[PDB]
Write a protein that binds this ligand. Sequence first.
Ligand code: 4LF
Ligand code: 4LF
Ligand code: 4LF
Ligand code: 4LF
Ligand code: 4LF
Ligand code: FE
Lengths: 174, 174, 174, 174, 174
Amino acid sequence: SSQIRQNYSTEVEAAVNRLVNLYLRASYTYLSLGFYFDRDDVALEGVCHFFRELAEEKREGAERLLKMQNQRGGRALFQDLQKPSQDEWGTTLDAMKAAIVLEKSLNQALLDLHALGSCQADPHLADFLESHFLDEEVKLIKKMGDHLTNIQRLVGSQAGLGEYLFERLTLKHD
Amino acid sequence: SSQIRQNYSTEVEAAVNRLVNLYLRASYTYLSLGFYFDRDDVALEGVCHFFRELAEEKREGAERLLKMQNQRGGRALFQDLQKPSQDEWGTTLDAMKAAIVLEKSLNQALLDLHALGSCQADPHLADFLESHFLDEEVKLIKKMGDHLTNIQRLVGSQAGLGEYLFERLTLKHD
Amino acid sequence: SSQIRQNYSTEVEAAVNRLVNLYLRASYTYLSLGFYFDRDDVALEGVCHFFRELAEEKREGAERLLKMQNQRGGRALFQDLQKPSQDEWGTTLDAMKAAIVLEKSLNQALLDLHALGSCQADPHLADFLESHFLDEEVKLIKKMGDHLTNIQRLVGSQAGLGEYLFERLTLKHD
Amino acid sequence: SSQIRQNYSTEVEAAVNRLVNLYLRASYTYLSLGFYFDRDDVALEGVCHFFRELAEEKREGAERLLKMQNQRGGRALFQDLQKPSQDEWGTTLDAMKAAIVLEKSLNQALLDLHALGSCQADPHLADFLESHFLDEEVKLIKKMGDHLTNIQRLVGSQAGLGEYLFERLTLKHD
Amino acid sequence: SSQIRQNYSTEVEAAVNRLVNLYLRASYTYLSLGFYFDRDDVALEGVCHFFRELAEEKREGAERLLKMQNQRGGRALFQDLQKPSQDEWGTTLDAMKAAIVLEKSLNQALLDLHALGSCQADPHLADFLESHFLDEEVKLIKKMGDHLTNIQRLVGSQAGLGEYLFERLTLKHD
Ligand SMILES: *C1=CC(=O)N(CCNC(=O)c2cccc(O)c2O)C1=O
Ligand SMILES: *C1=CC(=O)N(CCNC(=O)c2cccc(O)c2O)C1=O
Ligand SMILES: *C1=CC(=O)N(CCNC(=O)c2cccc(O)c2O)C1=O
Ligand SMILES: *C1=CC(=O)N(CCNC(=O)c2cccc(O)c2O)C1=O
Ligand SMILES: *C1=CC(=O)N(CCNC(=O)c2cccc(O)c2O)C1=O
Ligand SMILES: [Fe+3]
């Protein structure tokens, strides 16, 4: 247990368990966003697929953190997963704004954990976040910003038409 | 005849012949919907193809019911096929609303026959409808509802443009 | 919304949202079981892999239920996901007993929802559970019972040796 | 010489030559561990192969450090390689405990050199250790801890039987 | 040097070095146009790709001119590359108008150098420009004019919608 643990502070161990909770909460928020856009009275398949893929990416991030907790000899502790902030998510524009708010809060949590790791002279934690999380988040936040600008340009004065065209011509669908 | 019939009531036999008539009427309604959208003054190929494929699916449902009538020892009886309710079907939105009304009436007829079969303790009929009809209808009704929501969002204030874009970007065409 | 909903009671809609919560809670319990057996001071890879695969199967069950909620016109509502019942799971025998208790509680919830669906004459719900859930649960519960009997026969008077051999020779590992 | 050297302190250059010595000493310790388990009166092939592969991994680490010394313009200096701490290594459990002590001392030396590099604002050294050494050591230390727990569970009251089974069923052999 | 130079005037040699500067300035202007359309608050990928490909075509033109300078025995001389005329490029319509102004100025410089070469009875220079530059520029200017007409027809009264559709349906993108 303590049989392998070396240079791994209790502060980092607890912040990693909190980061796992935040990634699994973000995966749950994306599950709810994906099934909202699969409602027959919303019916934007490309938007459903975009959020369901992010639910899987965030679960994968949590699982990588949990593998790392165990590689360093810390102990995974799970807490309840709070339900998402909304039950209905509005338009694609509202949803994409909520998603970029969620990603910036995950990014800030990564940055905060990097700072704590660097303060405690834990370079394996710092490099783990730099290699597997920080650029994934910057790439994702840039894609969401590019989508938000396109959705915004499409609203104009024909909001239904623009929402359809963005789903059909930007987002991946069957 | 009576050489194979077992646990198959006269009530179920007659309701199956009525259900065959309803499926063949729905296939005829879809034949008329498909050729209306092939008119040179309507000219929405994807909508024509969507309804012509449903005419074939409903004929196939009728043929499965007729095969089942004979597997159970009942006797297929055919009645006249009433012509469709309309000679011209309006816009894609009008047509898709008429199609979901038609499917909900077929679905209710399936549900009614399931109830009659379960009341008469005929589990082969009940499982036949559950395996081959009830989820096909729920899947189709959900696809029609998703289309209706998309067509509705596209009308807005440029109805021609929206009808074209839905046909070009949602429905399958050459 | 109500544009497609037919023969789908508010009672079934709410029980489906509760069943989704139970499946996602069982997936979370299995995530915790999988990472406990990946601890360096537990270190039973085959047991970790057995529970991590069940975490994915239970998430998949929840996602099938949510797809069905939307196919029938109900509205997915999510609640908090309660953390698992334990933070540490003991031996493989303790873990496998907790898993069969969890599966029998999911099974009973399926049976209860089947009864509610049959009472409300909702054969699409009943057949959905029969086709995609009831035999999966009976197969899984039988595999867990076969494992429990093997783990029990292996304890005898050399419990460490038996736990190792079961992991190495029954469970799938690298 | 000084023709390419830039931002590379004498302190880092000497600590890299000491780290090369520690990696080549650890490779020699593993050569001795591998041939001890190939003795006809020890005869645990999987344990021999596990340590002989680590002798090659540690030589490879030393060679990467030496390539880096030259890429940065420092000068490789070699010292004597002290013989291993033991001539006979006891049981697999004793050997695996000595190996995890050796790896934690190499890991601490990596961490110490990272700190010196970060203090002297040498990010190429810091990233070199983070990319090629720190996670390799954390992965290896976690595998050794998982093995130690399995070997410990196998001793119980039949130590010979457990040592055989671990070699046969965990470690790679012909 | 003068070892190979034949029929190659100092006037042509200096005008070729000025033409290289103009092509490398046009490549830099296109680099800036490409990265402007990759901004998250502009986000038109097809427009970014169209200008980044032109940055490479103009660098290639400069490199062909420089190879020719050396084949004829002249001496390449480089001057500073003036930064582009704008830091932000407005809409796709503004950008495409600036691009056709830039191409007509490169074309006029080609025509001027052709005239100087023909006046000095330098047919290898004249044929070099005719074979590798004059029709490339006429093809490119015609494609830009076709794009400008399409972008103009799309503005109408819904400028955002038209800018999106042109990028999605004319320009090449992922
Ligand atoms: C409080 C702990 C501490 O030392 N301090 C600085 C940690 N360093 C960084 O945050 C940092 C960020 C990016 C790259 C680096 O190399 C780096 O050291 C605190 O926050
Ligand atoms: C009148 C006949 C009868 O018994 N009664 C109930 C038939 N049962 C169902 O309709 C039903 C629906 C869905 C699943 C079941 O298992 C089921 O028994 C009548 O309608
Ligand atoms: C209360 C509602 C009701 O009618 N009742 C019976 C529902 N039927 C079943 O539970 C059942 C179970 C298995 C197969 C069947 O066909 C079936 O009808 C209630 O629980
Ligand atoms: C003495 C030199 C110095 O500045 N100090 C800190 C060096 N920083 C770290 O050790 C460190 C560890 C992990 C990630 C970082 O970004 C980081 O700066 C000393 O030890
Ligand atoms: C001043 C030099 C000169 O003679 N004069 C004419 C050069 N000729 C052309 O410009 C020309 C253009 C296109 C085809 C030709 O064959 C051609 O000679 C000057 O400009
Ligand atoms: Fe640092």
